[PDB]
Design a protein around this motif. Structure first.
Motif, PDB file in Angstrom:
ATOM      1  N   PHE A 154       0.829  -1.193   0.000  1.00 38.14           N
ATOM      2  CA  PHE A 154       0.000   0.000   0.000  1.00 38.14           C
ATOM      3  C   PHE A 154       0.869   1.250   0.000  1.00 38.14           C
ATOM      4  O   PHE A 154       2.043   1.215   0.396  1.00 38.14           O
ATOM      5  N   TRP A 156       0.045   5.301   1.527  1.00 39.65           N
ATOM      6  CA  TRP A 156      -0.949   5.976   2.340  1.00 39.65           C
ATOM      7  C   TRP A 156      -0.428   7.327   2.867  1.00 39.65           C
ATOM      8  O   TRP A 156       0.761   7.668   2.738  1.00 39.65           O
ATOM      9  N   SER A 186      -3.158   8.328  -1.775  1.00 39.17           N
ATOM     10  CA  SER A 186      -3.120   7.604  -3.047  1.00 39.17           C
ATOM     11  C   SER A 186      -2.084   8.196  -3.980  1.00 39.17           C
ATOM     12  O   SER A 186      -1.676   9.341  -3.849  1.00 39.17           O
ATOM     13  N   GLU A 234      -3.798   3.634  -1.328  1.00 38.28           N
ATOM     14  CA  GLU A 234      -3.898   2.864  -2.565  1.00 38.28           C
ATOM     15  C   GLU A 234      -3.169   1.531  -2.413  1.00 38.28           C
ATOM     16  O   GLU A 234      -2.013   1.500  -1.977  1.00 38.28           O
ATOM     17  N   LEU A 235      -3.872   0.460  -2.747  1.00 38.04           N
ATOM     18  CA  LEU A 235      -3.357  -0.914  -2.749  1.00 38.04           C
ATOM     19  C   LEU A 235      -2.847  -1.293  -4.130  1.00 38.04           C
ATOM     20  O   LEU A 235      -3.516  -1.059  -5.126  1.00 38.04           O
TER      21      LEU A 235
END
Ligand SMILES: NS(=O)(=O)c1ccc([Se]C2CCCCC2)cc1
Ligand SMILES: NS(=O)(=O)c1ccc([Se]C2CCCCC2)cc1
Ligand SMILES: [Zn+2]
Length: 259
Positions: A94, A96, A104, A116-117
């Protein structure tokens, strides 16, 4: 040695000095202008096949944390959409923020999400990950936005282990984790050709960014923010704001999977 990071003195504005491709023609992330992105009827159905995924370990690498998978066979793969052939899941991680209003890497009409992954996959026609990153179609990264609201139950096992990998270089067993629990309901997506969003910034990625965010709780993301960029015994630098800002789109079009 690598000394890049996310602070004022080693962050995204400095990277180009050691990784000149930072100013290249297909860098990531980008802003996704939803009005300009065009439905592409040539896209085939997307196939996320994670039933046989085999997670192994979670690692704090001083930039983010990676959940690593057994990629010695086609156990979890991504196919279809814009992709030709088979892409094997190797890890997820991720990016962050320090606050819910940022984090993101991709943005949607300039909107930043809390995190965001990135589910990272490599093209098996190149045999190994190291070879794949040297090819323009070597990797497929499935990007998923996180917004703060209700808790994501499938995320909680990740959150629960972070206390044990606080600092750079720590790892822990992380077997029997199902990455399917991190997806939203819809597979509608945008796609474009880009790059890794960290050094070495290689232009080897087909980006597939899901339109529907997942919801995580404030308590879940707060636990991400307790991680450390530093190693054990060093001055504490919270692992927050580990995102690269949007880069110039240049000669690219973002395609939509949906009408
Ligand atoms: N071009 S780069 O890879 O981002 C890069 C940036 C900076 C440095 Se040294 C710097 C590191 C922060 C503390 C002060 C000294 C090396 C490499
Ligand atoms: N944020 S991201 O674009 O998904 C992303 C994915 C994977 C990596 Se690992 C890196 C290791 C050295 C050789 C190149 C690959 C970095 C960034
Ligand atoms: Zn990433």
């Amino acid at each position: 040695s690598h000394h890049w990071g996310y602070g004022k003195h080693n962050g995204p504005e400095h990277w180009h000095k050691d990784f000149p491709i930072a100013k290249g023609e297909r860098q990531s992330p980008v802003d996704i202008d939803t009005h300009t992105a065009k439905y592409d009827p040539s896209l085939k159905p997307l196939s996320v096949s994670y039933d046989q995924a085999t997670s192994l370990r979670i690692l704090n690498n001083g930039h983010a944390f990676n959940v690593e998978f057994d990629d010695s066979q086609d156990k979890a793969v991504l196919k279809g959409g814009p992709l030709d052939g088979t892409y094997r899941l190797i890890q997820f991680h991720f990016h962050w923020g320090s606050l819910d209003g940022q984090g993101s890497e991709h943005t949607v009409d300039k909107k930043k999400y809390a995190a965001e992954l990135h589910l990272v996959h490599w093209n098996t026609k190149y045999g190994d990950f190291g070879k794949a990153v040297q090819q323009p179609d070597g990797l497929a990264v499935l990007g998923i936005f996180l917004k703060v609201g209700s808790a994501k139950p499938g995320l909680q096992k990740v959150v629960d282990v972070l206390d044990s990998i606080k600092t750079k270089g720590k790892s822990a067993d992380f077997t029997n984790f199902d990455p399917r629990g991190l997806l939203p309901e819809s597979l509608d997506y945008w796609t474009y050709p880009g790059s890794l969003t960290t050094p070495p910034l290689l232009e080897c990625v087909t980006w597939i960014v899901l339109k529907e965010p997942i919801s995580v709780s404030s308590e879940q993301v707060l636990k991400f923010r307790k991680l450390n960029f530093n190693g054990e015994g060093e001055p504490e630098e919270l692992m927050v704001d580990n995102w690269r800002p949007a880069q110039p789109l240049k000669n690219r079009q973002i395609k939509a999977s949906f009408k």
